[PDB]
Write a protein that binds this ligand. Structure first.
Ligand SMILES: Nc1nc2c(ncn2[C@@H]2O[C@H](COP(=O)(O)OP(=O)(O)O)[C@@H](O)[C@H]2O)c(=O)[nH]1
Ligand SMILES: C[As](C)(=O)[O-]
Ligand SMILES: C[As](C)(=O)[O-]
Ligand code: ALF
Ligand SMILES: [Ca+2]
Length: 318
């Protein structure tokens, strides 16, 4: 019936494309077997890049292996890397990664992932390597949802829900991609801005001196107060709440906000972060921004949250 133009915005790796995958699962026909098979190479690539990053970090962070034998494994894994066909995972490689993942040194390095760049799904894939390499492996929906591919251009997702015809557009979030955003700012019905809660102790890939959350805060400030959005519903998704729940117990929020006095807890820290974003809206007197703590990889959560977003879009049309 009514056409709704939705824009998914946010900094690099915040979770935009994952929400898009969820729309296909929830509001379209989901993934076909053939579509799933196409993700094997992507998954094998992600898994390889993750362990490679952790291995590299061993040297970078000067962390020794638990068992010296792992050092040999690490080196031969490195040679295999530039030798194997991309997207593949030979048994010789899997056996090595398997042994490395179990190493205490590797684990200690894994825990220090915020000090270097590591795929969000590194732990997910590596801890489940046996299943992934089992001959005949076919990706599950969660495997597909956890996959990583940096996108840059604009992607349109169209679906019907509650009699509304959605035209959802997502774009890359890196600094280099933002210049072109303005071309998509016309006649927008709703903007979903995605910010990763767990980014508070992370630095940008574009500038290792810039805190990821400070970057998203700056970007949100620009977005929520933009001229083109005065009459558009804005919703904030504070994504990666699952990663955040674990992180908050180890990393102090003060890393990001030196002024924070509250307890480093999920509820407190989460609410404080939420306030930091929402306080940037200088049009609050005329427009309220709704926010949701989300886990883009969780279908039921995304299903729930998107249902609530459509309700807001519908209400705003009253
Ligand atoms: N654990 C977890 N991983 C997430 C979540 N949202 C996204 N990811 C993962 O983080 C990575 C980057 O997400 P992606 O959607 O590609 O980011 P985009 O660059 O903003 O499109 C992917 O590997 C996702 O599976 C989340 O809520 N929890
Ligand atoms: C149809 As597939 C989740 O493999
Ligand atoms: C570059 As637009 C999908 O905003
Ligand atoms: F910000 Al991206 F793929 F890294 F949309
Ligand atoms: Ca993307």
């Amino acid at each position: 019936a009514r056409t709704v133009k939705l824009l998914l915005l946010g900094a690099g790796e915040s979770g935009k494309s994952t929400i898009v995958k969820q729309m296909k699962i929830i509001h379209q026909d989901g993934y076909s077997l053939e579509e799933c098979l196409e993700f094997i190479a992507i998954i094998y690539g992600n898994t390889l890049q993750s362990i490679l990053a952790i291995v590299r970090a061993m040297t970078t962070l000067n962390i020794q292996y638990g068992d010296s034998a792992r050092q040999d494994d690490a080196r031969k894994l490195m040679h295999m890397a530039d030798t194997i066909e991309e997207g593949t995972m030979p048994k010789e490689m899997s056996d090595i990664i398997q042994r490395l993942w179990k190493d205490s040194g590797i684990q200690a390095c894994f825990d220090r992932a915020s000090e270097y760049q590591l795929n969000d799904s590194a732990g997910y894939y590596l801890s489940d390597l046996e299943r992934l390499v089992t001959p005949g492996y076919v990706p599950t929906e969660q495997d597909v949802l956890r996959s990583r591919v940096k996108t840059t251009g604009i992607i349109e997702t169209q679906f019907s829900f509650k009699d509304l015809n959605f035209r959802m557009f997502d774009v890359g979030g890196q600094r280099s991609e933002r210049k072109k955003w303005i071309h998509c700012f016309e006649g927008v019905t709703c903007i979903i801005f995605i910010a990763a809660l767990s980014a508070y102790d992370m630095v940008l890939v574009e500038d290792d001196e810039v805190n990821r959350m400070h970057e998203s805060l700056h970007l949100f400030n620009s977005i929520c107060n933009h001229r083109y959005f005065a009459t558009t519903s804005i919703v904030l998704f504070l994504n990666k709440k699952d990663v955040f729940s674990e992180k908050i117990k180890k990393a102090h929020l003060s890393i990001c906000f030196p002024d924070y006095n509250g307890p480093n807890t999920y509820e407190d820290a989460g609410n404080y972060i939420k306030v930091q974003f929402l306080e940037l809206n200088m049009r609050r007197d005329v427009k309220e921004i709704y926010s949701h703590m989300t886990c883009a990889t969780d279908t039921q959560n995304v299903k729930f949250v998107f249902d609530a977003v459509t309700d807001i879009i519908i209400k705003e049309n009253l």
